[PDB]
Design a protein around this ligand. Structure first.
Ligand SMILES: Clc1ccc2n[nH]cc2c1
Ligand SMILES: Clc1ccc2n[nH]cc2c1
Lengths: 225, 12, 225, 12
């Protein structure tokens, strides 16, 4: 017994996705970046399906559904990598078959970006982040993505309120020792925003340099305004 | 318009 | 009667600073940017003094005091411009003698950055942000600035907790109609982070282009790692 | 080191 929204988000959680880096291809920054962008493309399909499970998300206009996903997609991807990484030390679990350490981060040109993701990991390890809290924060990051393009501002605010309420009710029942735990969880969202912004900018620059092939969906979310 | 994001949001 | 930390932050609030744009200089993007950077330099002196009033801030190492200010300075400047702007429509009150509208934003190359600051304004107008809430969020943005360089992580976490508690106790007493108002205030910090990051990057690029003179303190915070 | 930020933090 905690909160039905939390229960519902847990059963909506997508299945594990394999990176499947091409074993015939020599190891290189281009291979690593190709593997990551391919993995992101596939995860984005599953993120779109998952969003439809979030109560009220479907009742927004298609424009408003697109705007929230265009602003939040990379925060959702990053929160996944952070959650998969909590039991690891200085490694990022992009996928069960794609665990990046510091050297692989240097070789891929991702040392600054992966260091920032590890800063999110460190904070969530010290807070002992629970799956329930992770799925609820992923939903809040979607609802709270601060798109410039929102048509129904009140509806988007009501989706924020519903999810925030779910987090607060979860924390009130599960963590009576810390009555400010919900707030402390919200206080982690600035770092996710910062990290997501840097990731989008880094991958947009790789897109511009033209050396890494990228699929249609990944490209469409990189090109969003 | 012909957006893959839109098409995926509209389907199933 | 609300919370003594809130009371203390209100009396610590620095006096109004004038932009004093040089009336002998022709209007130009360089004049506008020179005026803004000069104003920021002066505000940063007052921000350093203000931080010393925040309970526990002074008891951190000088390294930890420098790290929090190196990460949060621009968020603190921006929150000032946003608060001064709440009674205005599509104008940003950098100072009582420096109110920027859309055209002046275009002429200064600041249309994208000022549009994002106006997005912070719009949200705080709909929430009816109070001075008490503004001074408390400025302190929380300092404590929660996610510096990579923190020595005493537990001390910085205790400063976060003290200020968060102050916000929650203020909201519990002043806004019983909305028991989630404190959380909703925390939920505004991602947009401040995003906007602050874009501002730092924009002004760092102006620094690189070498066409706008900048004072020592402003330069030192732009060059922080 | 010779930082203006440090000098201002140390003074008054
Ligand atoms: Cl850049 C990036 C960030 C997070 C990811 N998760 N899966 C693929 C990813 C790629
Ligand atoms: Cl760029 C920038 C942002 C906020 C400011 N407040 N005062 C001077 C400012 C300059």
């Amino acid at each position: 017994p905690y909160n039905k929204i939390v229960s519902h988000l847990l059963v909506a959680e997508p299945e594990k996705i394999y990176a499947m880096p091409d074993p015939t291809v020599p190891d290189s920054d281009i291979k690593a970046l190709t593997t990551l962008c391919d993995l992101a493309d596939r995860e984005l399909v599953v993120i779109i399906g998952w969003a439809k499970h979030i109560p009220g998300f479907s009742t927004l206009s298609l424009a408003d559904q697109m705007s929230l996903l265009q602003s939040a997609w990379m925060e959702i991807l990053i929160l996944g990598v952070v959650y998969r990484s909590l039991s690891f030390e200085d490694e990022l679990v992009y996928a069960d078959d794609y665990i990046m350490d510091e050297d692989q981060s240097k070789l891929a040109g991702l040392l600054d970006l992966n260091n920032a993701i590890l800063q999110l990991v460190k904070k969530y390890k010290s807070m002992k982040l629970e799956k329930e809290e992770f799925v609820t924060l992923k939903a809040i990051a979607l609802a709270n993505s601060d798109s410039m393009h929102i048509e129904d501002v009140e509806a988007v605010q009501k989706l924020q309120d519903v999810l925030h309420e779910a987090l607060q009710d979860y924390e009130a029942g599960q963590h009576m020792e810390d009555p400010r735990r919900a707030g402390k969880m919200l206080m982690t969202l600035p770092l996710l925003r910062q990290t997501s912004t840097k990731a989008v900018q880094h991958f947009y620059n790789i897109k511009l340099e033209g050396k890494v092939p990228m699929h249609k969906l990944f490209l469409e979310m990189l090109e969003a305004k | 318009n012909n957006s893959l994001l839109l098409h995926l949001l509209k389907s199933q």
